[PDB]
Structure 1
């Protein structure tokens, strides 16, 4: 029943009892494990999720069983029975957004989970208003380089109508221009959204790092285009501490990682637009975004500049170039005084987080493949830590693209 969880570096063992609180099945069965897959393939039920969430909330404020708790359960029940749905109080929304983050198995930054600014944007009625709230978020979160975690929550999905959606996958994305000869200029991850923006009327540039406009959608309307004011998108030019030519690569990344296409589920209610942001771990930029062969793919270029023997894998040219690029990212963010965390510091804080959650809740859902960094895995303590992965609610969830 309750899995034993061992750390193989220290020999310490815990038991996950928190997983018993899971109500949603993942993709694994006793016949086969699907844990490396990136994606998975009525009133009575809303009422149970609603009730369980309100119980979660009153328990957190230590008022479990109180008058307030009972009356609030009655409101929820009365509202659902009459209308087939309900609405959260602001404080409940705040609690549920933090819990969704806390519950996120793929997030290595969860030590921070209790520190989240929640902007309530549920009184939004147009793409125009969405834009204003998004700019306020960016400005707040960016804070001239001293980044602060934030979420803005737009109106929940409703039975009658279409969703509020932000089409872009992040608030900040560089264009990817598909070229005649089949290559890509810019970020190949963003080809499709770049073509959408143009098709909806954007005048495209032709750089490797052109910031995309937002396509914002109010219910049952065509999305609208909105150019972010350049002054709101903080960027960091990349340079290397000792390698002078590196700056000459013209590389850069944006300060603010802000995910904008995930669904936030709290107590059975769904928030189809609820962008959220923290600060980056350097390997996201230095390893994945710049070195993935299907991303900016700069490994070779960097290795030649370093004059490495590129002819053979056993010279470890890829490994050496990747280290330097990661170093350049850390250096430059430090130089520009913009919050960043390296993969060693981040995984150490995650280990402290596991221990906190063990005491607090008796476990912590974690996806080992996503937690362990993409370079130097076993040099970080999380590589040696067993982890149990399961879905708790409140949750952030993947949702299909709106087009």
Structure 2
């Protein structure tokens, strides 16, 4: 049952015993592996048609409290058995329960620590948790968010942070942030099917316009937020320009690069995922850290269904775009990633390259093997989009499983 895990660069071997703690099922079976699938339908977080079984919830709850008390080394103590009873009496009576701030802080950190697709988990212990459970309006969500952004950005010296809004309650709508990230660029479906801006944001941009936003016409127009309080229509909120930090891209040696007019924001804040802690679900819990240069230079700027600048850059570099064997694509992508690192470093904004990032992840995997006897990792996401085998994680076998607390995907609110 326990996986023999091997690193092919070093020849070392380890056994993942942490996978035995996984209580949630993934999409794979012995007949076929679906590890490469981006999204689920089974691992998804289905709405509350009513309160989920008290036994099931109480089981996840007790396990979390147990995890919390081990965390502070006061396991088995009186403080522990009293807390387990509080949780049980509360579920038995109301069908749900509530967490203490310190449990929520522990839970939030464990959620990040448990995320298999995150290559930045070495930073898991340093996370600023903002308790925004004292929120009752879209207006209040906005204030909290602005404060999250101000703190997280920190003049360019980024700090990891998460804001937790009210949990889901049975028989009531969810608190939701309609945007996938707090900061994203608009995607305008310009007449001929083409899209000015980020093609991945066509739908959300249309929804913003539908809710009163007067749109722009640039390639990098920061989008407004659609915040939604329970059973209420989403409200539109324009983020103050002084709050959104952006880095204009330029190349260290290629003078003409800057003329491309490219730029990217400093803060990567995912705001569409569900945070699950002890059976409870927080539908609104935006989190942020800092960028790995490849997400910007490779994925966001070079993906075919995204900005797709690969060719424009290759033409400017005067590369042989006629044939694939000239490797014009590979050369252009490397220069774009270098431009991102140069630009962010020049602007004094936090950034980390894929080589440094994966090296740190290897250290993290080692820390975790010692600490918990394994570490859930999703190979396809941990290995960077360019230069895969050039990094240490490529040659490292990994085991992927679901551990709780956990960040999960959830249905779009519309």
TM-score by length of 2: 0.97
Give the Cα separation in 1 of the matches to 2:26 and 2:168: 24
Which residue is 1:238 aligned to?
A: 249
2:256 alignment partner, SS class:
helix
- 3-state secondary structure, aligned to 1:383: coil
Superposed displacement of residue 200, structure 1: 0.3
Q: Secondary structure at the match of 1:216?
A: strand
Please say if 1:379 is aligned against 2:390.
yes
Q: Distance in 2 between matches of 1:279 and 1:336?
A: 14
Deviations 1:193-237 (A, max 9, x none): 000000000000000000000000000000000000000000000
Give the corresponding residue for 1:7.
7
Specify the SS of the correspondent of 2:55. helix
Q: How much does 1:267 deviate?
A: 0.1
1:269 CA drift (Å): 0.2
1:73 corresponds in structure 2 to: 84
Residues 164-213 of structure 1, C-alpha deviations (whole Å, 9 max, x = no match): 00000000010000011110000001000000000000000000000000
Pair 1:29 & 2:29 matched: yes
> Which residue of 123, 127, 144 corresponds with 2:155?
144
Alignment counterpart, residue 279 of structure 1, candidates 274, 290, 315: 290
After superposition, residues 223-262 of structure 1 pair within 5 angstroms as 223-262=234-273
Deviation at 1:111?
Answer: 0.2
Find the aligned partners of 1:275 and 1:222 in 2 and give their Cα distance. 20
- Within the candidate set 188, 202, 205, 1:191 is matched to 202
Encode CA deviations 1:102-142: one digit per residue, 9 max, x unaligned.
00000000000000000000010000000000000000000
Taking the aligned partners of 1:152 and 1:100, their CA distance within structure 2 comes to: 13
CA shift digits 1:38-95 (9 cap, x unpaired): 011x100000000000000000100010000000000000000000010000000000
Aligned equivalents of 2:56, 2:327: Cα separation in 1: 55
**Where has structure 1 moved over 4 Å in runs of 4 or more?**
none
| Deviation sequence 1:237-280 (CA, Å, 0-9, x none) | 00000000000000000000000000000000000000000000
Q: Report SS of the residue matched to 1:230.
A: coil
- Pair 1:365 & 2:372 matched: no
Q: Give the superposition deviation at 1:148.
A: 0.1
CA distance in 2, matches of 1:309, 1:159: 60
Q: For residues 324-357 of structure 1, give each alpha carbon's deviation from its aligned partner in whole angstroms, at most 9, with x where no partner exists.
A: 0000000000000000000000000000000000
Q: 2:131 aligns with which of 107, 112, 120?
A: 120
> What SS class does the counterpart of residue 69 from structure 1 fall into?
helix
Shift of 1:160: 1.8
- What is the alpha-carbon distance in structure 2 between the residues aligned to residue 69 and residue 181 of structure 1? 63
Q: Number of residue pairs matched?
A: 402
Q: Secondary structure at the match of 1:382?
A: coil
CA distance in 2, matches of 1:148, 1:294: 30
Match of residue 19 from structure 1: 19
Extract unaligned runs of 5+ from structure 2. 41-52
In structure 2, the partner of 1:201 is 212
Between the aligned partners of 1:76 and 1:264, the Cα distance in structure 2 is: 19
Q: Distance in 1 between matches of 2:104 and 2:318?
A: 54
Matched residue SS, 2:386: coil
SS at match of 2:394: helix
Distance 2:292 2:326 in 1: 27
CA drift of 1:389 comes to 0.1
Question: How far apart in 1 are the matches of 2:215 and 2:59?
Answer: 49
1:298 offset after TM fit, Å? Answer: 0.2
Cα distance in 1 for partners of 2:122, 2:182 equals: 23
Instruction: Report how far residue 315 of structure 1 moved.
Output: 0.3
Q: How far apart are residue 31 of structure 1 and its match?
A: 0.4
| TM-score with structure 1 setting the length | 1.00
Q: Counterparts of 1:177 and 1:342 in 2: how far apart (Å)?
A: 31
The CA deviation string for residues 337-387 of structure 1, in whole angstroms up to 9 with x for no partner, is: 000000000000000000000000000000000000000000000000000
What SS is found at the alignment partner of 2:82?
helix
